[PDB]
Amino acid sequence: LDGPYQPTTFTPPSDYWILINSNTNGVVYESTNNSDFWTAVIAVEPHVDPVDRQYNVFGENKQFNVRNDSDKWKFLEMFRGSSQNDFYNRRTLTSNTRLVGILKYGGRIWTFHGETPRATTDSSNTANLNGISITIHSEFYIIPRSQESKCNEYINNGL
């Protein structure tokens, strides 16, 4: 576990988990290669009714209807696969640790989803993995993929 590091924009190598300590609602990260992959994660505070909210992602002011009906936080993965398609809520991570993870490896993006403490990983395909950069809005850490067991622990139970 290396970090914490301050909010920034960069392109991580493959084979490292980025573990973001989300401490603000709104946009947690923005990741794209500008060709076939866009994901922005949006943090939602507990006990929220279906309310529309504005989110400036990839320089675009977007509107999403969100609703977190769980003592836990909700992290929604907004995805689109072309610049012209609408974002959709592809995956959600419900957690009380407020940690979000992203890994680039094997040519596909890996993230955690489901509900803590039993969130697990899932993958997304791309034709240009190397080009996917990330703007991180919160203090984050880096953990090698060889220590994924620890990343999983952190995701589901905290630092």
Numbering used by the authors: 4 to 162
What sentences appear in the manuscript?
Rotaviruses are the leading etiologic agent of viral gastroenteritis in infants and young children worldwide and are responsible for an estimated 140,000 deaths each year in developing countries. The distal VP8* portion (~27 kDa, N-terminal) of the rotavirus spike protein VP4 from P, P, P and P genotypes recognize the secretor HBGAs. To understand the molecular basis of LNB and H1 recognition and binding to P VP8* we determined the crystal structure of the clinical isolate Pc VP8* in its apo form and bound to LNB and H1 glycans.
The first form, VP8*-Apo1, diffracts at 1.35 Å resolution and presents a single copy of Pc VP8* in the crystal asymmetric unit (ASU) while the second form, VP8*-Apo2, diffracts to 1.5 Å and presents two copies in the ASU. Superimposition of the individual VP8* protomers from these crystals showed that the three molecules of Pc VP8* are almost identical (RMSD 0.28 Å for the superposition of all the Cα). Furthermore, Pc VP8* are also structurally identical (RMSDs 0.37–0.57 Å) to the VP8* apo forms of the linage I PWa and PRotarix, supporting that the glycan binding site is preformed in the Pc VP8* protein.
